[PDB]
Design a protein around this ligand. Structure first.
Ligand SMILES: [Zn+2]
Lengths: 201, 59, 52, 112, 123, 144, 333, 88, 60, 172, 25, 53, 105, 93
RNA sequence: ACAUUUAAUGUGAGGUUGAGAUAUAAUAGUU
RNA sequence: UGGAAGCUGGAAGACGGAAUCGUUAUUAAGCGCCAGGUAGUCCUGGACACUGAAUC
RNA sequence: AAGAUCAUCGAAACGGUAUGCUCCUGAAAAAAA
RNA sequence: AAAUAUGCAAUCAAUA
RNA sequence: UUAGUUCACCUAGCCAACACGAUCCGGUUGUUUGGGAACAAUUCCCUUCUAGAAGGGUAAUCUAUGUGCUACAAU
RNA sequence: UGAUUGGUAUUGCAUGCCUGGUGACUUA
């Protein structure tokens, strides 16, 4: 273990030396702007087309062709479609079309049901308990007391996973948001929409 | 061992089929409780008990 | 800090570089230092280094 | 060895205050870079999947999840690290023997 | 039963059936049918990326390794993944995905020449 | 099934992922607890020494600060012959979450300070045998 | 620690302060009992909250405010516990630790001593109802003019009554128009002309009780999300790319991110913002399709892939090349 | 042999064909389930006619074998198996 | 009075060597434990009382 | 397979360069940085240009080259296996050249021959005219570019309990 | 990996419902 | 978030102990609690209702 | 439909100042460029394409004029105005070095 | 002398967040400079996160103690752009 | 579900500080 | 020369010389299964169960 | 789950090193007989 | 016999 | 809440887990771009065809050791 | 989403902590 040889920089080396240090990981911490993202994507595509290709690329392209043929892609027809930018999102539509009670004395469901949610309590803690934001509603189709067509529509819409045949029970879950109140509101809205769709039967 | 863990006593014990010995150290109240337990609260045949080398006021 | 202060008081530090660095780092008590975390990262390179 | 000149019994280092480790500092830098650039990589992958091309993403080589390693929190070693502890063998041993795990259900009287 | 291909429970994770008749097949057969029935799918939809897969409509071309390997690349190994995909994380039946693709493509059932149906599993 | 409750934990221990077993970790809490222990042990006695250094102007400073803040200063000093005892306290450093649990002991706190006690007969981080908690002896070692 | 110089720090003063704190805790418990008997909630607290009657809300708010006003400020504790059980138990524990513990066994049995007190057992079942018992139920029902906090509910009702009285002096129509229930939901905020978007603020405690950010408060997006029935991505559902394929892709991404856990709302917003611009400044999707399809035909022929040499041949054959324009030690020596 | 494990106590007591047997078994394998069923059948037979348990005592039908699998040891491939130790 | 419902005991392990270097055949196990116990109240009318008791029962 | 790199592009080869130079040159003029704006290094050395004449090849090699090059997609980079015939067909010409490089990285960027240098010298004024035109366009360039961001429409001023206090602001 | 484990995976596929040969070809 | 929760929290952001701040906290923690806006508005509304009975 | 129209108006008014999510894509080579050379924009006997365009920055907010030489369409060397001026200044030395190396050859 | 008493935000008797943001407790002159600079620019520092506050503090310290060439950000990003983004995100009340 | 469009978009042209020494004008006019 | 699969298989190999190792019955021996290394990767390490003896 | 029970074809019909096309992971396991 | 069409583990009836 | 806190030697092992002495640099430290061995070799060659989205053969070298995995047993 | 006071340089023949191998651990 000895000292590394010292090299006296030449005048040429000092004159042709970078005036700024190279980009570090500490600098990379700053996110890439969308302009750089797009430029990198364009450069990679151009290089790959230019000839830095691979067999995996061909296989991936064939798989994408199969997906497009089965129609599970975002490609646009040249004649059917080619020959809006602002839209109402599905959750906003659900909220807007939802009907809410005027007062706690008014019920907008009219059928038996049970609402379940989980809450966590304990000594002081710095980390929030995971898996405590979902809520669900359970009810019996017989209690709902619908016609045969409406019951079949309900079962088909909810699928076999949400239907327990042993006791004729059906459950609907909502764990789409990390907040229990938001999950409960979404659950109520979707339950109302489900009942409307069942009545459409 | 359970009694000593509860009472925060220290030292050592040694139990066998017919005898037992030990050297116990700790607070005066804890020592008195241990003495009472050994004299009256042992679930085995205790024909004789003896205490010796008692010292107090240790730093 | 305590170890270096003891060794410096007993004059057990030989290297002048070590003496200077340890004196600059440990002589002034944290409460008296104008900036407690006077430096971070490498010892001889100051914290906001754009090169390290 | 039966040391010929035994030294004093040294007090162990603090549990929560590890010594400087530039490798750990760079690991933290990589972790934060991945946290910041996670969305951009998702955008890259979305664009490539929509275009149906299996192209590389070089910037992930530097700001990706796979540049991060599980390093000992108390020792700085980058091997033999479990998520349930985040510490290496000696860090875990010191923590257990200092009595910080009795509250958290650790049972030293259990072998298996 | 020693090596019967159903397990004890007669699992059919790759089987697909048509609800209009008793016809049923598996995912590889479904992929082959999709590649063979491009003309019907294209007509219903209605040098070009749309028709790039037409050459694969020939039985002989598919029989040839030139087409058989393309068939096997398109139909991969859904029941083979990573080694960590075990226990509770074992692969599940992609029959639902295959049925959805078939229904959206409106491929015709070989035995009844219908348009929809094609539920999962075997009837 | 001869020993059911003996093997009760085997299923979770061996044949379940941690993320799906439901076992609750301890790292994210002990990490803050150890630093709390060190900070308290380092700062409490010095705080008490600083408080007791003068020991004569404590009440005067309290009176002046009460005048500055509340404007009355008669809550602690109704008359000249009333003594207001000062209890040493330290800043709270561990980000405990405020919870609706009415029995939580650190949710109704509003001052950002906690009382500190130098007396504790039972040592909390009980080591095994002769081992000493790290960071306890700052005096440099002496060799033979 | 210097010897005692002023009697303020003497032990008897400390014992007196502890006794005074315990006395104040007992006074507070007595006051709480008197308030409970003076302003009882008929039918139970939960039933009163669910019914939402003006008298019940008024009585609950009055009782809560009186308790808040009467709650003392102790000397030996810096935690102003609103629960008389907690206050009394902490005072008893402090006194026991100060002048009742002989040894470690006593310091450990302090908690059993506290739990064996009958009065504490009685007070154990008299704490306030946490909001989450009913707030999720109200949200599921769909009540937006609600508040689990009794004082807040009373304030809302009283403000509504004041506004109605302002008009009470074609008049019933105007009064109903001024009534809160008859206000359109679209008009609550100009930027969200859709109904059922704003809910009732939860009364659950928030923030960090003790840290470097003890009084930081809610974040910019947290303040907004605490006032909605549930979040929606309508903020970014505009000015989508003119290209049809990219517009469809971004719309699908927005729809999927609306129903997706593991993604923060800020993360979704930023992702959409970046993706929109990326697609906008990228080339046409159909042009990319044509170019890629021409570059990668269905069948892979020979010679269509870049040739790659062995790693050992490229690198591991000794020192053969160094890239440096200005080096004092070139490979020639 | 598994069938005999299950149905021997009926023969030993002489009640072969007198009784119809209904069994619910879970866990283990063929031989383990056979042993559990043998023990259960013996217990049921002694409950039906306690005085006839002498016929089962000698055969040891009413014995509950609590032996469990030997745990694998650290540093060993199995409970007792190990790598081949190489000298030098 | 609720209906008691005992729940099993869970465990977890982390395995480490006994030595700071070499000696892979010397190993140590760190075992953790959890316990769960469920109590069910039915047709609860005194919601406030039941919740207060349940939350104030928690110890340690 | 362990303890190795991750880049196969290094094993592969990049774009074929019009002018070939031994980089770093054995003999070259002192390197001077062109400017500090982008850290460009400039030097002068000797380069060579190679050209292949398909006519001066055997029939089999020529037909194979045509087959590989005239396909829909060029095969094998449009070359032939190296050999004496291909080497003889290829003709090399030597000429002085001017080369650029990136500082620190020292990656070769371009190589310009004397003909190119003289031609750009003669065409310098057109470069300035084009720069002036681009600078003039820069106005509308920036004007259009400043509105390229997709902005989220967020609640700028949301009051407390809007549902319960819709009193202050309201239309009709 | 091990031939036995490969055969085990093939047997798992067969149980799941995919007829694949067990020959180690 | 999960990957950015590995190491210890910063040890240079721990609050310092200052006598002035201790006295300020001691003075402030005894601050009075005013009557609630809900009750004040309730009184005002009662007066208005009595006036306009 | 009415709700969507109101939302469109509100969003446009809110986002006028900051960003409207426009696109300034022009392909490669950019259509706003300025040619350098003959009708094919080729300079020199080696037929090297050259065009001047306002290069974009990493943030996509500010642009700078730049002369780009391309081997066909792929850009190999790009020079800003300052770099071009510096090269013009240094050319006489470049000429001397090239003459010396030609004499060497 | 002595530090100015903190202003409780609402329903509190203290606030360590304000002291930390102003760099009074823990005392940190670089953080005090960061607070003053952001206040002068027009950024509501109290509304910022810990990460952003520390980033701005580090950037300002580096710029002050190494030169105006530093700090240097990739992708042609600038400290002025960062400051503008922070001002837009947290308008000063 | 009732659902085009905030302003530009010119050459065949898609690669916006070049992913880089090492024989083939190969590729995005010809060579 | 990451792992898995398929078509073909002109790779050794017929229980292995001097010598040499593991093993105390739910054990040897055989068989499968799975947590963890925070993408993929072992026949390693650590476990789990099923069949299950012989020998002084 | 396998080694099962039962019941067929059956002896180098063993063995599976080797071999470019195919599949899985990942930004990256490329070329190749 | 107008009952069934039958292989077994390493968690759960204090709940399948 | 259940830890052999046990003793002696092999100057046995670990300063590359960590701490702490001696002694050495503070560049004997950090940062950026890459590499970090054995599976050669020659777009491997040749033939046909408008082009293959075709067809055929050739292919050395690998010192020794320990441990695992997989294999060879009928006539 | 809370980073830091250099060295994986020598010295295990200076040591602490921790391990391997061999020995022991008998009382009334
Ligand atoms: Zn059919």
């Amino acid at each position: 273990r000895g000292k590394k040889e010292k090299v006296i920089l030449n005048a040429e080396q000092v004159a042709t030396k970078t005036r700024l240090p190279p980009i570090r990981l500490e600098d990379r911490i700053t996110p890439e702007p969308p302009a750089t993202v797009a430029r990198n994507i364009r450069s990679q595509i151009s290089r790959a087309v230019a000839g830095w290709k691979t067999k995996r690329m061909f296989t991936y392209r064939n798989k994408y062709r199969l997906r497009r043929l089965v129609g599970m892609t975002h490609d646009i027809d040249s004649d059917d479609e080619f020959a809006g930018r602002t839209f109402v999102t599905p959750l906003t539509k659900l909220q807007h079309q939802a009907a809410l009670p005027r007062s706690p004395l008014h019920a907008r469901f009219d059928f038996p049901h049970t609402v379940h949610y989980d809450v966590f309590w304990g000594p002081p803690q710095v980390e929030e308990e995971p898996n405590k934001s979902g809520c669900w509603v359970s009810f019996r189709v017989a209690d709902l007391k619908l016609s045969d067509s409406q019951e079949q529509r309900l079962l088909d819409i909810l699928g076999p996973e949400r239907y327990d045949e042993q006791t004729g029970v059906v459950c609907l879950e909502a764990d789409v948001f990390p907040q229990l109140n938001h999950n409960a509101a979404y659950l109520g809205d979707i339950l109302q929409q489900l009942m409307r769709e069942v009545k459409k039967a | 061992l359970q009694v000593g863990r509860d009472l925060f006593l220290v030292g050592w014990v040694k139990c066998r089929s017919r005898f037992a010995t030990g050297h116990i150290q700790g607070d005066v109240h804890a020592l008195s409780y241990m003495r009472r337990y050994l004299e009256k609260h042992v679930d085995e045949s205790v024909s004789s008990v003896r205490f010796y080398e008692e010292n107090f006021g240790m730093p | 800090r305590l170890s270096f202060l003891d060794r410096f008081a007993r004059e057990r530090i030989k290297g002048e570089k070590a003496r200077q660095l340890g004196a600059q780092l440990y002589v002034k008590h944290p409460d008296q230092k104008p900036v407690w975390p006077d430096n971070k990262g490498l010892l001889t390179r100051k914290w906001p280094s754009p090169f390290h | 060895m039966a040391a010929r000149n035994p030294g004093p019994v040294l007090n162990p280092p603090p549990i929560a205050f590890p010594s400087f480790n530039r490798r750990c500092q760079k690991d933290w830098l990589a972790r934060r870079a991945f946290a910041e650039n996670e969305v951009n990589g998702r955008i890259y992958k979305n664009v490539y999947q929509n275009l149906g091309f299996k192209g590389p993403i070089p910037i992930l080589n530097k700001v990706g999840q796979y540049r991060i390693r599980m390093r000992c929190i108390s020792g700085g070693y980058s091997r033999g690290i479990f998520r349930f502890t985040r510490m290496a063998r000696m860090g875990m041993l010191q923590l257990a023997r200092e009595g910080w795990l009795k509250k958290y259900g650790y049972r030293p009287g259990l072998f298996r | 039963a020693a090596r019967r291909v159903g397990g004890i429970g007669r699992r059919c994770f790759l089987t697909l059936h048509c609800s209009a008749c008793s016809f049923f097949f598996q995912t590889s057969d479904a992929i082959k049918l999709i590649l063979t029935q491009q003309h019907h799918i294209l007509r219903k939809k209605g040098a070009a990326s749309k028709f790039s897969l037409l050459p694969l409509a020939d039985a002989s071309l598919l029989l040839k390794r030139r087409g058989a390997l393309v068939l096997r690349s398109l139909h991969g190994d859904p029941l083979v993944g990573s080694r960590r995909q075990r226990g509770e994380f074992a692969p599940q039946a992609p029959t639902a995905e295959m049925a959805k693709m078939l229904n959206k493509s409106c491929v015709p059932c070989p035995r009844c020449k219908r348009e929809g149906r094609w539920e999962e599993g075997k009837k | 099934m001869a020993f059911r409750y003996r093997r009760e934990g085997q299923f979770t221990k061996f044949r379940v992922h941690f993320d799906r077993s439901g076992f609750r970790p301890y790292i994210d809490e002990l990490k803050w607890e150890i630093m709390d222990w060190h900070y308290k042990r380092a700062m409490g006695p010095q705080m008490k020494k600083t408080l007791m250094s003068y020991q004569e102007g404590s009440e005067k400073l309290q009176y002046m600060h009460d005048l500055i803040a509340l404007g009355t200063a008669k809550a602690k000093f109704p008359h000249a012959t009333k003594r207001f005892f000062f209890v040493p306290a330290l800043p709270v450093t561990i980000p405990y979450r405020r919870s609706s649990n009415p029995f939580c002991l650190l949710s109704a706190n509003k001052t950002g300070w906690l009382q500190w006690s130098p007396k504790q007969r039972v040592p909390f981080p009980q080591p095994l045998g002769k081992r000493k908690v790290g960071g306890t002896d700052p005096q440099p070692p002496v060799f033979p | 620690d210097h010897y005692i110089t002023s009697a303020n720090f003497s032990e008897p003063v400390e014992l007196l302060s502890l006794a005074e704190d315990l006395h104040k805790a007992e006074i507070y418990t007595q006051t709480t009992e008197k308030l409970e008997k003076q302003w009882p909630a008929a039918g139970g607290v939960a039933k009163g909250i669910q019914g939402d009657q003006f008298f019940d809300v008024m009585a609950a708010a009055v009782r809560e405010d009186l308790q808040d006003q009467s709650r003392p400020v102790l000397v030996n504790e810096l935690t102003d516990h609103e629960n008389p059980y907690c206050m009394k138990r902490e005072a008893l524990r402090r006194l026991v630790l100060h002048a009742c513990t002989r040894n470690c066994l006593d310091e450990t049995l302090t908690d059993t001593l506290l739990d064996r007190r009958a009065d504490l057992q009685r007070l154990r079942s008299k704490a306030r109802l946490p909001p989450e018992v009913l707030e999720p139920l109200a949200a599921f029902v769909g009540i937006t003019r609600f508040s689990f906090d009794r004082r807040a509910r009373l304030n809302q009702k009283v403000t509504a009554v004041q506004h109605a009285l302002r008009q009470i002096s074609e008049k019933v129509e105007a009064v109903l128009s001024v009534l809160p229930e008859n206000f359109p939901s679209d008009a609550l905020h100009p930027h969200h002309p859709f109904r059922n978007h704003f809910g009732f603020e939860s009364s659950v405690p928030y923030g960090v009780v003790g840290s470097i950010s003890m009084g930081k408060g809610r974040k910019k997006i947290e303040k907004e999300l605490a006032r909605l029935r549930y979040p929606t991505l309508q903020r970014v559902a505009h000015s989508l790319p003119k290209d049809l394929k990219y517009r469809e892709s971004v719309a699908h991404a927005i729809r999927v991110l609306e129903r997706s856990r593991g993604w923060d709302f800020e993360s979704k917003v930023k992702a959409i913002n970046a993706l929109v611009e990326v697609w906008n400044r990228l080339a046409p999707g159909r042009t990319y399709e044509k170019i890629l399809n021409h570059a990668f035909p269905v069948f892979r022929g020979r010679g269509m892939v870049k040739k790659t040499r062995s790693r050992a041949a490229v690198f591991n054959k000794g020192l053969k090349y160094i890239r440096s324009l200005t080096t004092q030690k070139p490979l020639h020596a | 042999y598994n069938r005999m494990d299950v149905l021997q106590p009926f023969f030993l007591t002489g009640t072969a064909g007198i009784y119809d047997l209904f069994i619910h078994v879970r866990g283990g394998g063929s031989s383990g389930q056979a042993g559990a069923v043998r023990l259960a059948v013996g217990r049921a037979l002694v409950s039906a006619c306690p005085a006839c348990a002498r016929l089962l005592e000698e055969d040891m039908v009413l014995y509950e074998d609590t032996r469990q699998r030997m745990p694998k040891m650290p540093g060993r491939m199995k409970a007792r198996k190990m790598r081949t130790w190489t000298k030098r | 009075w609720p209906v008691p419902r005992r729940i099993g005991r869970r465990q977890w392990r982390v395995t480490y060597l006994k030595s700071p270097f070499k000696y892979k055949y010397a190993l140590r196990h760190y075992v953790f434990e959890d316990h769960r116990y469920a109590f069910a109240f039915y047709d609860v009318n005194s919601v406030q009382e039941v919740v207060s008791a349940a939350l104030g029962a928690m110890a340690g | 397979w362990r303890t190795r790199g991750f880049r196969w592009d290094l094993c592969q080869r990049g774009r074929r360069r019009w002018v070939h130079i031994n980089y770093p040159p054995r003999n070259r003029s002192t390197v001077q940085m062109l400017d500090e704006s982008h850290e460009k290094l400039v030097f002068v050395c000797n380069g060579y240009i190679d050209r292949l004449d398909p006519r001066l090849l055997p029939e089999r090699l020529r037909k194979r080259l045509e087959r590989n090059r005239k396909a829909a997609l060029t095969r094998f980079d449009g070359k032939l296996p190296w050999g004496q015939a291909v080497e003889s067909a290829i003709k090399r010409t030597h000429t002085p050249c001017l080369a650029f490089a990136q500082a620190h990285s020292h990656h070769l960027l371009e190589a310009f021959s004397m003909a190119e240098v003289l031609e750009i010298e003669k065409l310098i004024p057109e470069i300035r005219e084009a720069f002036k035109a681009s600078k003039a366009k820069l106005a509308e360039q920036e004007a259009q570019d400043k509105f390229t961001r997709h902005v989220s429409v967020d609640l700028v001023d949301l009051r407390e309990d809007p549902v319960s206090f819709p009193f202050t602001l309201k239309q009709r | 990996r091990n031939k036995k484990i490969r055969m085990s995976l093939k047997k798992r596929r067969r149980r799941k419902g995919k007829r694949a040969p067990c020959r180690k070809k | 978030r999960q990957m950015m929760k590995w190491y210890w929290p910063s040890k240079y952001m721990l609050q310092d102990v200052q006598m002035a701040q201790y006295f300020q906290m001691q003075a402030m923690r005894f601050a009075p609690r005013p009557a609630h806006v809900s009750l004040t508005t309730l009184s005002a509304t009662m007066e208005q209702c009595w006036k306009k009975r | 439909r009415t709700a969507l129209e109101s939302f469109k108006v509100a969003s446009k008014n809110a986002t006028k100042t900051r960003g409207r999510a426009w696109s300034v894509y022009e392909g490669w080579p950019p259509r706003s460029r300025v040619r350098v050379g003959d009708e094919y924009s080729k300079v020199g006997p080696l037929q090297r394409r050259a065009f001047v365009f306002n290069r974009v920055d990493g943030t996509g907010r500010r642009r700078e004029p730049t002369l780009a030489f391309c081997c066909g369409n792929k850009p190999v060397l790009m020079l800003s105005e300052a770099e071009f001026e510096a090269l013009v200044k240094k050319l006489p030395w470049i000429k001397h070095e090239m003459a010396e190396f030609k004499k060497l050859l | 002398y002595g530090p100015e008493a903190p202003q409780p935000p609402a329903g509190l008797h203290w606030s360590w967040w304000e002291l930390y943001v102003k760099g009074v407790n823990p005392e940190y002159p670089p953080r005090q400079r960061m607070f003053a600079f952001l206040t002068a620019q027009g950024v509501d520092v109290l509304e910022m996160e810990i990460r952003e506050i520390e980033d701005v503090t580090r950037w300002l310290e580096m710029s002050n103690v190494y030169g105006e060439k530093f700090p240097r950000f990739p992708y042609d990003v600038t400290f002025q752009d960062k400051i503008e983004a922070l001002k837009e995100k947290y308008p000063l009340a």
